[PDB]
Design a protein around this ligand. Structure first.
Ligand SMILES: [Cl-]
Ligand SMILES: [Cl-]
Ligand SMILES: [Cl-]
Ligand SMILES: [Cl-]
Ligand SMILES: [Cl-]
Lengths: 192, 192
């Protein structure tokens, strides 16, 4: 089994990467791709409460609760089946977004997440490392960004910077290269 | 203002005491009493998810942590800023004794969870209704018990013991006496 998470700011081509890597790994591996809450009912119920000016800490705890449901009801049973699990975003996202970019403190958010994952850290974490400039362009094309969004975007990147199982891939290259690098990085882990 | 919480295991007379002490204090102080989640919408939603649950206890602990903060930010804090005395039935200490000790999640982990949730907002005074396991058992029965229940009850009391802003009150006495002591205990604090 292998628990593989994918991390990165918006504009890192994370969606394309996970989907294309998934499609290539599926040939030889019992692999599944998921993203919290990933269909888990309670997880969905929890998320929805947020979706419906809620305190940022309240939000953080709900996302944490949702994360654990997805972990206990979907990821673990999968890892026990001996499957490779590709997860779009995990504890690191919360650290960079809630802890760093939003101001709660990487400190407290990490303790929260450790409470949620109960020692189950990713076997491998791909960090799609994209510069703010290239990231910004991908974000726009996938729609000029507000001065505030640009700033927050930059803070998320710095957050991940500080944070970095980690295997960084250059997400400033064309997505075809970002896909090849991520795939090789992964096949390398699954073969050793 | 003053944030006063009431703690104690089942069968300690807690409900009767807070209510009787509340009615009595309203006559001479600008006080209100609330019971988590105190009617806060978000609190009721977050809670119901737990009620509609074999749910993982950490998930439960986090959801109840979320509920506690909504109640804190949307109700307790605003009332405290209005110069009011706020009597609260249950707070972090309850979680510590129940989830932390009794349920065996880990006092330290549950503590960290609650600190994230209260963000430094600790009670000014905490009333611990100290009742013996034997008297508590009898009150519960008064209002035969299974062996697991009895032992869980015991763990709860043992947890509170280790946790103990605290002013303990001998809850083995007749309720009438528990209320008086509790009332005199609070009055003392409010007039110092
Ligand atoms: Cl999914
Ligand atoms: Cl399982
Ligand atoms: Cl890189
Ligand atoms: Cl491209
Ligand atoms: Cl009595």
């Amino acid at each position: 089994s292998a628990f593989i998470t994918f991390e990165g700011p918006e504009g890192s081509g994370k969606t394309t990467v996970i989907n294309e890597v998934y499609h290539r790994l599926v040939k030889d591996y019992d692999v599944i791709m998921t993203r919290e809450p990933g269909g888990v009912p309670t997880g969905e119920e929890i998320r929805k409460i947020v979706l419906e000016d809620m305190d940022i800490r309240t939000e953080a705890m709900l996302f944490a609760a949702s994360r654990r449901e997805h972990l206990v009801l979907k990821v673990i049973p999968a890892l026990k089946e001996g499957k490779v699990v590709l997860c779009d975003r995990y504890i690191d996202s919360s650290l960079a977004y809630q802890g760093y970019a939003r101001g709660i403190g990487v400190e407290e958010v990490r303790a929260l997440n450790e409470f949620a994952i109960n020692g189950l850290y990713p076997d491998l974490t791909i960090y799609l490392n994209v510069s703010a400039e290239v990231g910004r362009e991908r974000i726009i094309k996938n729609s000029r960004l507000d001065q505030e969004d640009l700033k927050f975007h930059e803070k998320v990147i710095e957050g991940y910077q500080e944070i970095i199982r980690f295997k960084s891939v250059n997400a400033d290259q064309p997505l075809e290269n970002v896909v090849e690098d991520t795939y090789q990085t992964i096949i390398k882990y699954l073969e050793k």
